Amino acid sequence: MDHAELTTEQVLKRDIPWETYMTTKLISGTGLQLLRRYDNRSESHRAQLLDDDGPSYVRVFVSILRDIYKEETVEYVLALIDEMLTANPKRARLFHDKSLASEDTYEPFLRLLWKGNWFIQEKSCKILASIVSARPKPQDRIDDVLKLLVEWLCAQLKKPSHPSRGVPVAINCLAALLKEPMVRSSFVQADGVKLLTPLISPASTQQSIQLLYETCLCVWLLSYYEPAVEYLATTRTLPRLIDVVKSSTKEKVVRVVVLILRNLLPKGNFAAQMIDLGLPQVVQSLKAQAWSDEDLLEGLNQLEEGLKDNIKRLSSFDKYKQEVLLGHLDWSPMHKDPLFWRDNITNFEENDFQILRVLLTILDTSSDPRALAVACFDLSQFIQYHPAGRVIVTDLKAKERVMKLMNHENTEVTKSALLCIQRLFLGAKY
Amino acid sequence: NDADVSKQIQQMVRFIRQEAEEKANEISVSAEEEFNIEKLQLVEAEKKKIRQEYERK
Amino acid sequence: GIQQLLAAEQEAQHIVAAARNAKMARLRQAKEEAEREIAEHRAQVER
Amino acid sequence: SELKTTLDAGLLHRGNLLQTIGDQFEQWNLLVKREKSIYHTLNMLSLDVTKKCLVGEGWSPVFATKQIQDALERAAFDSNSQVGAIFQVLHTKESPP
Amino acid sequence: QFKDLNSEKSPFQRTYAAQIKKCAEMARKLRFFKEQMLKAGILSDLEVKLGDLEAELVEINANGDKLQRAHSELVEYKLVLQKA
């Protein structure tokens, strides 16, 4: 991208005479000859001569990088080697030699983390290419190497160079490494996620909009890896990210954020509650502020439906249906809270409390005192919810249910039936 | 026209590059990764079954 | 003028269709690739 | 007496907040006017999917049309998008009032 | 000023008349709030905040009226009991 182009321009702008350094007892004359013949090697790569092009040139490039530790000569060395180190297809034969095996990939690790940001672009690209294949990047080759090399965080903190010079490069490298689950879920990547939590919140700048897109790509990569999901749950700014997505001018960024939220199909109770707050407001506004791809809008609608389904998952009507409606009384939301009791009674009493009449009829002929106890407790809550409703329940079989097992051998059923009768009496007279 | 038409053409080209490429590559990469992960999980289940058969043998 | 915008829209639609087709092809290829990998793992376990 | 005192205190607090609410609405008078005007103009305007920019055509003074570029540039800078709106003049038989 | 080409095509939802409907709901809320303020006499996202404030003011006025009615009822009871 722009960051990689700027880094490559800065690296290739400075020229380093390998012959002078070799004569200065820092390199070998054979190294200078190989550097001079690297142009013919590249031409033969264009001419399909793999032997001179990349085969020895992989070891030659490794030796040149190891010998030229100084960033000044490393600029020209990495500029020359960038053709092979850019990607597996770019200079395929040399790239195939570099990434052919775990040992070959680990060989570039010594070359990696060298020189400044200009060469660090190629270094990060090669690190990702080695890390793209899980076998090429063993933990000692390269999660441990990446974690112990804080040069990545340093290139990320190289603010004077540009706004997104290491940042776009690091984001692209992380996205590429997301292909390998180990690279994505490595604590090295997880550690940077917490460090990047403040960057998640604000995206005011136009450049920050691209930074916001990079953050969204990182969010998708985290959604790919379960340990990364755990780290993101530990990571903050999730509600801040939700608010930013709500105030998103770029509809593509909002769609990416919504896609990340949908990919967070896992519970994550904190983010779930935040989205529940968002679902009433953020999701509603997004539905109102439909834009860009119709497929994105459909995905947003599906995510809103999923959020609505997940909302009040614990405090759902399932418990009330299993307790009162099913006929075998159990834990019900109505008994839990008087407001929920009134809400359930509202649906229950339509015609002379038809649903409540059915519940009372079920409770009256209840052999099991425990289910009878739960039904009588629900009846007591409903009767106490409405004074006239209490008299209605007393008219219905709720008084019959209270009379049944009113002072039986069981204590819970007796207490619940007495509570129902007392609530009916309290509602009978004010 | 003049700067207006040139700006319009530049905007169209910018749309073509940025808007089309970003969503396209994002969708392609995400779908490829998801398919790879799901089929790897299926292959892992098959390998667990094969390991059970080998243990029986 | 506007013809360039129409060609831009057509190119964007073609790119989207290509992305969808690439996703389907990637899934199809991944199925066979993982099947072959599982077969090789079974072979080495047999060894 | 207690209920009346509570009601009076609530009403006094409501009026104290309502003074600032009324000032906010007075600003929101102009705000809502601008919002309604923008909504009506957008409904009048037609979006162009291919160009991704909504198309707006109106009868404008040919001489004064030179000054619209200032407002357009101000909006573009406020939007900060690299996309640049283009205003063109069309010759036609239609006679603008 | 632009003619209503999209509205002429369809008054229902036009091209961005969904945003126009949202703005219409906001304007209805603003008109209700302005009427309430005129009843009071004050000097006269953000729309949601204004609607919430208007709802709170309406609830406070209703509570005050209910409390005044309750005070009237209690005064009636006290006067009747004192007369008895």
Mutation site for A-interface testing, chosen from E25, E45, E49 by largest number of A Cβ within 10 Å? E45
Maximum pairwise Cα distance, chain D: 79
SS (H, E, C) chain D: CHHHHHHHHHHHHHHHHHHHHHHHHHHHHHHHHHHHHHHHHHHHCECCCCCCCCECCECCCCCHHHHHHHHHHHHHHHHCCCCCCCCCCCCCCCCCC
Q: CB distance C9–D48 less than 8 Å?
A: no
Q: Is A252 on the interface with B (CB under 8 A)?
A: yes
Note whether A390 and A426 are within 8 A (CB): yes
Three-class secondary structure of residue A134 per DSSP: coil
DSSP labels, A26-61? SS-HHHHHHHHHHHHHHHHHHTT-HHHHTHHHHHHH
Note whether A54 and A99 are within 8 A (CB): no
- Residue with the two structure tokens 């991208």: A1
Note whether A75 and A14 are within 8 A (CB): yes
| Angle at CA of residue A173, ends A167 and A177, nearest 5° | 145
Q: Is A182 on the interface with B (CB under 8 A)?
A: no
Q: CB distance A293–B23 less than 8 Å?
A: yes
Question: What is the spatial distance between Cα A195 and Cα A236, in angstroms, rounded to a whole number?
Answer: 10
This structure's resolution (angstroms)?
4.3
Measured CA to CA in angstroms, residue A176 lies from A8, A91, D91 at distances of 19, 19, 53
Three-class secondary structure of residue E58 per DSSP: helix
Alpha helices in A178-311 (DSSP H): 181-185, 187-195, 197-200, 206-224, 226-234, 238-246, 251-263, 269-278, 284-288, 294-310
Note whether A119 and A85 are within 8 A (CB): no
φ, ψ of residue A237 to 5 degrees: the values are 65, 10
B26 contact residues in A (CB cutoff 8 A): 217, 220, 256
Q: CB distance B5–D83 less than 8 Å?
A: no
D54 φψ region: left (φ > 0), alpha (ψ -120 to 50), beta (else) = beta
E25 contact residues in A (CB cutoff 8 A): none
Size of interface D-E (CB pairs under 8 A): 133
φ, ψ of residue D3 to 5 degrees: the values are -65, -40
- Locate breaks in chain E with C to N over 2.5 A; list the residue preceding each: 44
- Residue with the two structure tokens 């790569």: A45
Total Cβ atoms within 10 A of residue A1: 13
Chain length of chain C: 47
Size of interface A-B (CB pairs under 8 A): 17
Q: CB distance C27–B42 less than 8 Å?
A: no
Measured CA to CA in angstroms, residue A358 lies from A342, A398, A399, A415 at distances of 17, 10, 13, 22
Question: What is the spatial distance between Cα A12 and Cα A364, in angstroms, rounded to a whole number?
Answer: 90
Distance from CA of A143 to the nearest CA of D (A): 39
Question: What is the spatial distance between Cα A275 and Cα A266, in angstroms, rounded to a whole number?
Answer: 13
Three-class secondary structure of residue E2 per DSSP: strand
Distance from CA of E48 to the nearest CA of A (A): 10
Q: Both tokens of residue E34?
A: 């302005």
B29 contact residues in A (CB cutoff 8 A): 175
Distance from CA of A387 to the nearest CA of B (A): 58
Q: Both tokens of residue E20?
A: 């126009």
- Residue with the two structure tokens 């009237």: E72
Per-residue b/e over A225-252, b at no fewer than 16 CB within 10 Å? bebbbebbbebebbbebbbbbbebebbb
Question: What is the spatial distance between Cα A34 and Cα A382, in angstroms, rounded to a whole number?
Answer: 91
- Residue with the two structure tokens 């004077």: A160
- Separation of CA E11 from chain center: 27
Question: Which residues, in sequence order, are CB contacts of A247 under 8 Å at separation 6+?
Answer: none
C39 contact residues in B (CB cutoff 8 A): none
Q: Both tokens of residue A187?
A: 């604590």
Question: What is the spatial distance between Cα A148 and Cα A179, in angstroms, rounded to a whole number?
Answer: 22
- B 2-41 residues with CB below 8 A of C? 5, 8-9, 12-13, 15-16, 19-21, 23-25, 27-28, 31-32, 35-36, 39-40
Q: Both tokens of residue A1?
A: 């991208």
Nearest residue to A230 (alpha-carbon basis) of A199, A196, A270: A270
Residue of B nearest to A184 (CA): B33
Q: CB distance A220–B30 less than 8 Å?
A: yes
Q: CB distance B37–A256 less than 8 Å?
A: no
φ, ψ of residue D58 to 5 degrees: the values are -150, 165
The DSSP bridge partners found for residue D55 are D46
Q: For residue E84, what is the enclosing H or E element?
A: none
What sign for the dihedral angle of Cα D10, D11, D15, D16? negative
What is the DSSP code (8-state) at residue E15? T
Measured CA to CA in angstroms, residue C23 lies from A142, A184, B37, C26, C28 at distances of 29, 21, 13, 5, 9
The DSSP bridge partners found for residue D58 are E2
A290 contact residues in E (CB cutoff 8 A): 18
Nearest residue to A78 (alpha-carbon basis) of A108, A103, A47: A108
Q: Is A288 on the interface with E (CB under 8 A)?
A: yes
D82 contact residues in A (CB cutoff 8 A): 206
Question: What is the spatial distance between Cα A231 and Cα A223, in angstroms, rounded to a whole number?
Answer: 11
Q: Both tokens of residue A255?
A: 């769609």
Q: CB distance B39–C31 less than 8 Å?
A: yes
In the chain, the amino acid numbered A369 is P
- Separation of CA A360 from chain center: 49
Q: Of E15, E26, E60, which has the smallest distance from its Cβ to D14's Cβ?
A: E60
Question: Which residues, in sequence order, are CB contacts of D61 under 8 Å at separation 6+?
Answer: none
Question: What is the spatial distance between Cα A278 and Cα A272, in angstroms, rounded to a whole number?
Answer: 9
Q: Both tokens of residue D92?
A: 């036609």
Q: Both tokens of residue E31?
A: 């008109």
Q: CB distance B4–D86 less than 8 Å?
A: yes
Q: Both tokens of residue A421?
A: 């009768």
In the chain, the amino acid numbered A153 is L
Q: CB distance C41–B13 less than 8 Å?
A: no
Residue of A nearest to E21 (CA): A288
Measured CA to CA in angstroms, residue D7 lies from D14, E39, E41, E64 at distances of 10, 18, 19, 4
Nearest residue to A63 (alpha-carbon basis) of A30, A21, A15, A99: A30
Question: What is the spatial distance between Cα A384 and Cα A398, in angstroms, rounded to a whole number?
Answer: 13
Per-residue b/e over A359-383, b at no fewer than 16 CB within 10 Å? bbebbbebeebebbbbbbbbbbbbb
The DSSP bridge partners found for residue D46 are D55
| 3-state DSSP helix/strand/coil % of chain E, to nearest 5 | 80, 0, 20
Q: Is B49 on the interface with D (CB under 8 A)?
A: no
